[PDB]
Amino acid sequence: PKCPECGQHLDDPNLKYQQHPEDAVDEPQMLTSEKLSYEDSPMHRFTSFSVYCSRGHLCPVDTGLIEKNVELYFSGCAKAIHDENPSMEGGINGKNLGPINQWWLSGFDGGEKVLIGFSTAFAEYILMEPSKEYEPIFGLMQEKIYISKIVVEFLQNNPDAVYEDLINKIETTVPPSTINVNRFTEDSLLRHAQFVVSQVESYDEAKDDDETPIFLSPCMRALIHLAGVSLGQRRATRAPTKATTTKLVYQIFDTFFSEQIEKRRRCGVCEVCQQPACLKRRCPNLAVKEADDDEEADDEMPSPKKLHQGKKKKQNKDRISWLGQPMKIERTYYQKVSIDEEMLEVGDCVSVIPDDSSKPLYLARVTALWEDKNGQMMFHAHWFCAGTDTVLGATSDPLELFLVGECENMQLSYIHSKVKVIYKAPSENWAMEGGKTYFFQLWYNQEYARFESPPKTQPTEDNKHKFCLSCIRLAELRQKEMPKVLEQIEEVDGRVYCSSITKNGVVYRLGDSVYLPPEAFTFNIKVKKDPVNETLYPEHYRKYSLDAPEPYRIGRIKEIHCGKKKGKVNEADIKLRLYKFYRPENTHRSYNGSYHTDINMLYWSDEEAVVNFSDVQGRCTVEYGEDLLESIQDYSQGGPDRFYFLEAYNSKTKNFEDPPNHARSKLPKLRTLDVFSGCGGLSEGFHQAGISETLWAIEMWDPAAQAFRLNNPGTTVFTEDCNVLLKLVMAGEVTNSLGQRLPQKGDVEMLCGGPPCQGFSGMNRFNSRTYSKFKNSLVVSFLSYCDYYRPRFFLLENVRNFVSYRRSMVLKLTLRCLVRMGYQCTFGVLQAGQYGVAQTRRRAIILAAAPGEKLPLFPEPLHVFAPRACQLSVVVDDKKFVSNITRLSSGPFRTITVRDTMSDLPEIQNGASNSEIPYNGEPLSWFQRQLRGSHYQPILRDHICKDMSPLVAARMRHIPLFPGSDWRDLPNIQVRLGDGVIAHKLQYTFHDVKNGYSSTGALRGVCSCAEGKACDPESRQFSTLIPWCLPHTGNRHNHWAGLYGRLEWDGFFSTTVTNPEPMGKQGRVLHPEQHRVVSVRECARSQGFPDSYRFFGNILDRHRQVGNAVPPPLAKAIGLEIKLCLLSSARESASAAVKA
Ligand SMILES: [Zn+2]
Ligand SMILES: [Zn+2]
Ligand SMILES: [Zn+2]
Ligand SMILES: [Zn+2]
């Protein structure tokens, strides 16, 4: 019993038949009425409507029957186009009104004007209210339509919105009384995914701009993949931001566009492709792939080859003759001047023509001039680097050269011409200056991509002739790397026993402690599943289609025994006898040691080991706790590489005895402005490192600016657009609107900030479209703040991919900009997890130091972390750039786990709303002890989590506790959803040709596409415990591994969480044990925020605050590198005040 025209089942109890009114005259006759008074189709209103098949069954319109060619007829009261009355008053009745040509919509912009309309070969109709009988059908259609309105209006306002932003928008929208639904959930969006998506695509075709289609925003692409959407199904129709630049900054971006600015695998299958300068044949399937592809980068390639090592051509010899008297005599005889038709003097610059493999004319500075024992007239060439050959490439000034550590001896014959090379030195008031020939400003380090201030070491009279800065640089480096013996005692055999040695500029005496790889030495050693019920766990079959290393070994120096090279000591074969230290985990305690133990603590062991000095990783202080003048806490925080012991451990007895007797015995706070401050995470870390004071912050979002105020009372927190506050200082205004005191030149010592990269964040080459955005971006505004203020220190923090955006053009242009201003600058990727947080998050960091200060290094990882997460290198124009970081893999401390992070917090349930609750317990882990304080605090603030819908909540309760459990572990069971609502079972009705049958011979398919056919809609199940969408799109998305996943106690957070959603893109977000999502505080702990840190606004505002922040431990680490630059520069002036 099915309809041969509309398909509807006759046994369906919701089926209804059409009932005509009397008047009911057919379409043509109805249309010739005087009740009626810009298109060749009469437009009229239409109330009390009903849609039906030739057989008379009331029909939906949204179901695609019209498209499947099925003739649909209608009836009701036709009224006048201006008549707003939804009653059958001023109107004629019509019946079986001509087969519906197509249906349409309008009002996707202005007011709540969403009008539904029908089109017939006779006329156009603007549907008013439906008939009694047809009302429920038009009712479901009304829902579908409202959701589509919310989505479209939200996307016009908020493009760039992420999946979690949409879910919140939908969940939060209060539908009018007229809609039969109380509120829309994620379950609704998934149910009407095909409708919504096809409507969002329709809006794009309809109103036309040069702007990005709305179906391509992140939330929309996330929906398309998660739900099983078929793109391309067509339907219905109906001044730019200016950056406050400085002259300098403007010209860089201006003089880049005005140069570099130049100018397809379509699916075929879709309805868009299957249609014919008219063009709107833009394949949605290709568009999605392209947009998804543009979001991915390339993370290994060899060390870049050193320049100037190619062949050179010789110039013809006319007259080459020395002028003046020899400067010195060494087998070699130096001279101040030489003749080569014209005059060349020690210190001039020359051009050397190479074997033109690209034709780039080589440039050098004439270091020395001499005549070798064979009468060959030589010169030493200290090579220059063309800007187009530094990281900068094409963006650089073509007249700009750079100093390098590249120099070689050559015959005077290679010289083609003497070249004028000017040093563009900084002014006396370079700091107050904010707004032809070859020149150079900086010294470039190819490997690490550091532009720094020229050495400024002047020639001694002993080497006034031979003076090469590259030779001096190489010298220092070779002698620092060198393993040399400082003081030697007495030899036994052919091995000399010493009291002190050195390497990497670190001095190692006897009794000092050392770091070593875990493979250096050893300690004293130690010594199958059953079938699943597949009817109950039908998705578990999907469960099957390198971890963190060990921290350093530690030992105290007993002997420095050595070897002998014929005459003296064999500097290479320095050996070390050491006393082994155990970490509580190394001990029989193992994993049970590592919990409550101070990350700092060790145990003494009379055990001995011999290793090479070449394996020593560094020095560290291991002291006895009872022979300490301060408390362990005071000691441990006092400085880096500080470890302690209070007991000793006998491996044989497995006992802890007291240790033996032989085991015993101002900083300038830079005045900071933090643009795009947030709640102050970066300001916090920098405050902890002691290097700063944040007196000014700029944050446009009220809840964040409020939260920054709470935590920094001394700060002037501006909430105006930074572009306005800049135009205001560049006008002499001393105060803003509220009368807040504007910072001026000299006030700001350090400038930091995280500029958003809104409309250009993508990997492909620039366009007219993408450049436009970047040209006036906050990156441009931020660089301008740097140019006007001329701060001593600068930091631009961002997502790691900032380094790869637009073929690295965002990075290259940022560096070029810093260079034109005259700054020492560099870049690097850092992994948050390596500095003490239970989270994998990389960040691009752009450091800059003013001429006069020194350019800081990137900090050495303090924590051992998984290698997969620590991919720190950057490819720029197919050359591999690396930072000064040496600790590739290892480090002094064990990883910080989710357990360390939150194992102390008291239980909370889903929807937990009390912001101020007792702790109900003491801290457990070392980490917890740190963020809580070494005292008593009563209140636990922000241990608050989202009230998830009864459906989500029920799923969370059914996720098991075993580490690694996600949605694949859910049971296929009916659950009473708190209210009247009942979460039903997922029906397996299709074959999965690729996945086979279950162990019970059951089907695994959930949609017709599992069999290779097209999707059959309304095979689409909703309000199921196992979400229908997941088996639907599983095979193409790695079985959505992690979705509804609980964090592992031993694990970490996947990324910075800003809004936890179980089917989102922010990773495993459920609590390891409790039937809820991670709390605001749990996230704050993942970010290494002290427990006393304050947040502001509603729950979501507090989640976004926490998640948007730079983790304070990463900022402390960076801050401490600034510490060394300050200390080092403060003592350099002091050891020069004496010489003056
Ligand atoms: Zn029918
Ligand atoms: Zn297509
Ligand atoms: Zn040299
Ligand atoms: Zn399907």
Swiss-Prot record:
Name of the protein in question: DNA (cytosine-5)-methyltransferase 1
Sequence positions bearing Phosphoserine: 148, 188, 303, 321, 453
From-to range in the entire protein, with total length: 357 to 1612 of 1620
Location of region: DNA replication foci-targeting sequence: 1-189
Provenance organism: Mus musculus (Mouse)
Binding site for Zn(2+): 3, 6, 53, 57
Places the protein is found: Nucleus; Cytoplasm
Region listing for Disordered, in residue ranges: 291-318
Residue sites binding Zn(2+) 1 per the record: 267, 270, 273, 283
Ranges annotated as biased composition (Acidic residues): 291-299
Job of this protein: Methylates CpG residues. Preferentially methylates hemimethylated DNA. Associates with DNA replication sites in S phase maintaining the methylation pattern in the newly synthesized strand, that is essential for epigenetic inheritance. Associates with chromatin during G2 and M phases to maintain DNA methylation independently of replication. It is responsible for maintaining methylation patterns established in development. DNA methylation is coordinated with methylation of histones. Mediates transcriptional repression by direct binding to HDAC2.
Region described as Autoinhibitory linker: 285-341
Further facts: There are three 5' exons, one specific to the oocyte (1c), one specific to the pachytene spermatocyte and also found in skeletal muscle (1b) and one found in somatic cells (1a). Three different mRNAs can be produced which give rise to two different translation products: isoform 1 (mRNAs-1a) and isoform 2 (mRNA-1b or -1c). Association of DNMT1 with the replication machinery is not strictly required for maintaining global methylation but still enhances methylation efficiency by 2-fold. Pre-existing cytosine methylation at CpG and non-CpG sites enhances methylation activity.
Gene Ontology terms: cellular component: cytoplasm; female germ cell nucleus; germ cell nucleus; heterochromatin; nucleoplasm; nucleus; pericentric heterochromatin; replication fork
Modified sites of kind N6-acetyllysine: 16, 336, 466, 529, 543, 880, 946
Tissues of expression: Isoform 1 is expressed in embryonic stem cells and in somatic tissues. Isoform 2 is expressed in oocytes, preimplantation embryos, testis and in skeletal muscle during myogenesis.
